[PDB]
Amino acid sequence: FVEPKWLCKIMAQILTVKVEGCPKHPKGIISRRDPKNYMTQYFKLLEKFQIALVPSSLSDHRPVIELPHCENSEIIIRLYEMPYFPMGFWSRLINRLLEISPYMLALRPNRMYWRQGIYLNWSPEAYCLVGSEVLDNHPESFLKITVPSCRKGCILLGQVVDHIDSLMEEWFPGLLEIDICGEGETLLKKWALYSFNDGEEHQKILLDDLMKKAEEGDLLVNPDQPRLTIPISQIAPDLILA
Amino acid sequence: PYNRMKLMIVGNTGSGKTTLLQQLMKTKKSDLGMQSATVGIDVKDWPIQIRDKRKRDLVLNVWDFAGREEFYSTHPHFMTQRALYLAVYDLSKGQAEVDAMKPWLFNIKARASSSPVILVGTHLDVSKACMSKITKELLNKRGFPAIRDYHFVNATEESDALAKLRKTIINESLNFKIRDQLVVGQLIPDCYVELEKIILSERKNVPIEFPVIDRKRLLQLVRENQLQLDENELPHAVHFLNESGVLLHFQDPALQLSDLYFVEPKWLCKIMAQILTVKVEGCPKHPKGIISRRDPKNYMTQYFKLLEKFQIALVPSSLSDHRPVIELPHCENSEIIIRLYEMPYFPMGFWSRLINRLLEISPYMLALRPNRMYWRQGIYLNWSPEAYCLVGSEVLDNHPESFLKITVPSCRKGCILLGQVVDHIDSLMEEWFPGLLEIDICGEGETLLKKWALYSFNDGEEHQKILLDDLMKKAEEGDLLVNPDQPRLTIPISQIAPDLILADLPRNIMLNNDELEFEQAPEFLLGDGSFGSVYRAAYEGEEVAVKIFNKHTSLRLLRQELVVLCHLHHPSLISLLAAGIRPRMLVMELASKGSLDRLLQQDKASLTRTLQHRIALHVADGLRYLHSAMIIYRDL
Numbered sequence A: 001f002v003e004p005k006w007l008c009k010i011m012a013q014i015l016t017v018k019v020e021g022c023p024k025h026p027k028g029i030i031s032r033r034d035p036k037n038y039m040t041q042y043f044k045l046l047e048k049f050q051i052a053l054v055p056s057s058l059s060d061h062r063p064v065i066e067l068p069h070c071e072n073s074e075i076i077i078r079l080y081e082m083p084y085f086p087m088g089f090w091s092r093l094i095n096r097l098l099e100i101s102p103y104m105l106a107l108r109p110n111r112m113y114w115r116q117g118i119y120l121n122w123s124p125e126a127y128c129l130v131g132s133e134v135l136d137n138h139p140e141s142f143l144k145i146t147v148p149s150c151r152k153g154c155i156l157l158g159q160v161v162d163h164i165d166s167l168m169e170e171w172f173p174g175l176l177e178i179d180i181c182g183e184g185e186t187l188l189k190k191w192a193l194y195s196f197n198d199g200e201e202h203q204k205i206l207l208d209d210l211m212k213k214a215e216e217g218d219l220l221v222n223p224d225q226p227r228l229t230i231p232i233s234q235i236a237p238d239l240i241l242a
Numbered sequence B: 001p002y003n004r005m006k007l008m009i010v011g012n013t014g015s016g017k018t019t020l021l022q023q024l025m026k027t028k029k030s031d032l033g034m035q036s037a038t039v040g041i042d043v044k045d046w047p048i049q050i051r052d053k054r055k056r057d058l059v060l061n062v063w064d065f066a067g068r069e070e071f072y073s074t075h076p077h078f079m080t081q082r083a084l085y086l087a088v089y090d091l092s093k094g095q096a097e098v099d100a101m102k103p104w105l106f107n108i109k110a111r112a113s114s115s116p117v118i119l120v121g122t123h124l125d126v127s128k129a130c131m132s133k134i135t136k137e138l139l140n141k142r143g144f145p146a147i148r149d150y151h152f153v154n155a156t157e158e159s160d161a162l163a164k165l166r167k168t169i170i171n172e173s174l175n176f177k178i179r180d181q182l183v184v185g186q187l188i189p190d191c192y193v194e195l196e197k198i199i200l201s202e203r204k205n206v207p208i209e210f211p212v213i214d215r216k217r218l219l220q221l222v223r224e225n226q227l228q229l230d231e232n233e234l235p236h237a238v239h240f241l242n243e244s245g246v247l248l249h250f251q252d253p254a255l256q257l258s259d260l261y262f263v264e265p266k267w268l269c270k271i272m273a274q275i276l277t278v279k280v281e282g283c284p285k286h287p288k289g290i291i292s293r294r295d296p297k298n299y300m301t302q303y304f305k306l307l308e309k310f311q312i313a314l315v316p317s318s319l320s321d322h323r324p325v326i327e328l329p330h331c332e333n334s335e336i337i338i339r340l341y342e343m344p345y346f347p348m349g350f351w352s353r354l355i356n357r358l359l360e361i362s363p364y365m366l367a368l369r370p371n372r373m374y375w376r377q378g379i380y381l382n383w384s385p386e387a388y389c390l391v392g393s394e395v396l397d398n399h400p401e402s403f404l405k406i407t408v409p410s411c412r413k414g415c416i417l418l419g420q421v422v423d424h425i426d427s428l429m430e431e432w433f434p435g436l437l438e439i440d441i442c443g444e445g446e447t448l449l450k451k452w453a454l455y456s457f458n459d460g461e462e463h464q465k466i467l468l469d470d471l472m473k474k475a476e477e478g479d480l481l482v483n484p485d486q487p488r489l490t491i492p493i494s495q496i497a498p499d500l501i502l503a504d505l506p507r508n509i510m511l512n513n514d515e516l517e518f519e520q521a522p523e524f525l526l527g528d529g530s531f532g533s534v535y536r537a538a539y540e541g542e543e544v545a546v547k548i549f550n551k552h553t554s555l556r557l558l559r560q561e562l563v564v565l566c567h568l569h570h571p572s573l574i575s576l577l578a579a580g581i582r583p584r585m586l587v588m589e590l591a592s593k594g595s596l597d598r599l600l601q602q603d604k605a606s607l608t609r610t611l612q613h614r615i616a617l618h619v620a621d622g623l624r625y626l627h628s629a630m631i632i633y634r635d636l
């Protein structure tokens, strides 16, 4: 591509072409509606540039999902508290998990991805909701991922946390960068959520992954009241090769 | 005589509804220098003492419905059939508002077909009056209800233009005449009119914070007076006062509030709309539409012990209009079953009712709940890529109608969902909007709701799925296959509409006509009972008793009965063996020795004090199971 100012202009002509006709489709999806073989070359580059379905300008309003089993003990959760969603994060993320239909391996799951989530589900016993909510009294931006704690779910978590990390260090490598000056804030604190009470715990206690990974000398976690304990397999089945 | 009617006022976010009514009733004060938009429906009543030869002092209560599009989810509760509906243009936006008023006229037609309508152009002060053309061209006699007049009042001051409207409301009321009855002047027992006078006289003596009355307090009001009504009269009496809008009361058994008697309707109708306006300009920690119990003495508990009872609880309205892009797993034109429901306009309380009838059905494939994602006009509850159901709503191209597309995977677990959603969506259509599915023999049988079915001979890449009306296709039950004018290739009807064919019910009860040997016409095989309807036949080489159905039971009900018979399965309950069409018959076991009444009527010597017991033991064994499945026989 000689004359960069041209390609950089073409890739943004698609993100402005609206239609004030009939919204026969939901917001964000669009079919090939337009010269000499160039139109064919066009989205032989846009699709190559991942912008094809337009993962941006896509239904910001999220739809109310009601997960089947949500009793505080069947779900695994892992936040990704970061101060701001990086610029091209979601359109990159939801286009890395999208093209992975061969989970549980080629049975594609019927998914419903808004701007900042995917929620591709095979069955009420195996799903994965890579959402994004805002907590209370918190100006950060989180990335909640809820997965059923069964066997078919321990795979999805350990397989999404990979893609979401293979993207973080490939594209935004200064997020996960130890700033030894001051203190090691690291700018991205991948929390994990656990609760001793299986249900009605009234809260899921945060637990930094860095501190919890160092708790591999044993296999169980437990509070300052050491009567009851949780196997790490349940709360973070990716650090343990489960 | 009972002189009391309902005069519903109807408009849309800006009209002479609450400012035309104040002049119709001739409210001289209207002290509020500046009033606000309506919340709820504002039930009021004004008497009309017609100072004439006829001393009939009729009093009709007005219900000036709110126009804002967020209360529409609750209006179909209060659009009854004994009423004279109004309608208001706002002619200032001439020829563009009459279009925006078709939905109201349509819901009036859906709810109360046999009621009049009086279009009332509310603006003259501000300008365009050729709108009488379109109302005569498109709005007069095309599927919409019977418009009986149309006026162009000023709606802010008394005038000759308005006075002649007040006169039409009278003459149209005194000539209501549904099925030649003249409703406004019927005769009723004075025991009701006196019951009407005490409730009104009690409306002044009730806690304003909760004007509700319990039946205990009610059964004492009749004791204070000398009312001759008994416990068998009130359930009818207090209902006839309901249709007249004196008090609200709901006899539904599921909604466990039938002890609550809502006097002062204008209050309950206002409370149910306070929830639909309370917003929060704080933090959108939740998606749009969902909300938790964030708010006095135990009333808040009673509050959504009524809202949930009123289905408004998750608020199925004001919920994420924008739909999310779903990408179904198998969508290759041959694995999906589709069935449109082309209707001219979505009725008022359709979706909030529909998505709350399928929602509460988690025991599909029966208690495994599927993780669902329901926007305003869809559900898409899915168990697995092999079993899902998307009750969507899209708008086709070059079509002003409103469709209800339902796509389901064509497998076995999917043939059930279609045959189980089409039931709920029909049990709702005839229960709530019975004038939609009403054959208008005048003109032609448009039927106002054309439930298409979609089929394609090419499994994939058909480039289109050809429409096929269900009424015409149901008549193609003489055979089992459909095929085009090029009769080489053909489609089994099981694939395109597995509900007309009894393919959704358990697979063991398919008729399999190849083995059923049965002679309907003769009577010497109709031996069961005496001059009855259930015959005798053979099925799989064994003796059975088929039950031919007459013209009464429609297929939608036969399919509704088999679903409960199919899962009893007790050695002391007549069990099904098959059920099919051609004709609509039902196969069961053949009780060789006939019913019991015929035995002890002519064979009283066969009961031998140990057969008298095994009979009573097998009947008490059936009741031991029916009462276990929470179903009472009611006739033994």
Ligand SMILES: Nc1ncnc2c1ncn2[C@@H]1O[C@H](COP(=O)(O)OP(=O)(O)OP(=O)(O)O)[C@@H](O)[C@H]1O
Pocket: B528, B529, B530, B531, B532, B533, B534, B545, B574, B588, B589, B590, B591, B592, B594, B595
């Ligand atoms: N499964 C069966 N096997 C043998 N006889 C039966 C069976 N079911 C019903 N009968 C006989 O059929 C007769 C009529 O059946 P049905 O259930 O229609 O009774 P009904 O409602 O009194 O009759 P109808 O509806 O025809 O007036 C009864 O007298 C009963 O003796």
Ligand SMILES: Nc1nc2c(ncn2[C@@H]2O[C@H](COP(=O)(O)OP(=O)(O)O)[C@@H](O)[C@H]2O)c(=O)[nH]1
Pocket: B011, B012, B013, B014, B015, B016, B017, B018, B019, B020, B035, B036, B037, B038, B065, B066, B067, B068, B122, B123, B124, B125, B126, B154, B155, B156
């Ligand atoms: N000038 C004029 N104003 C009107 C007329 N009808 C209604 N309005 C105004 O519009 C408002 C009417 O309230 P309304 O729309 O009936 O409430 P809603 O219909 O219940 O939402 C009031 O502010 C009136 O002053 C009219 O005929 N002429």
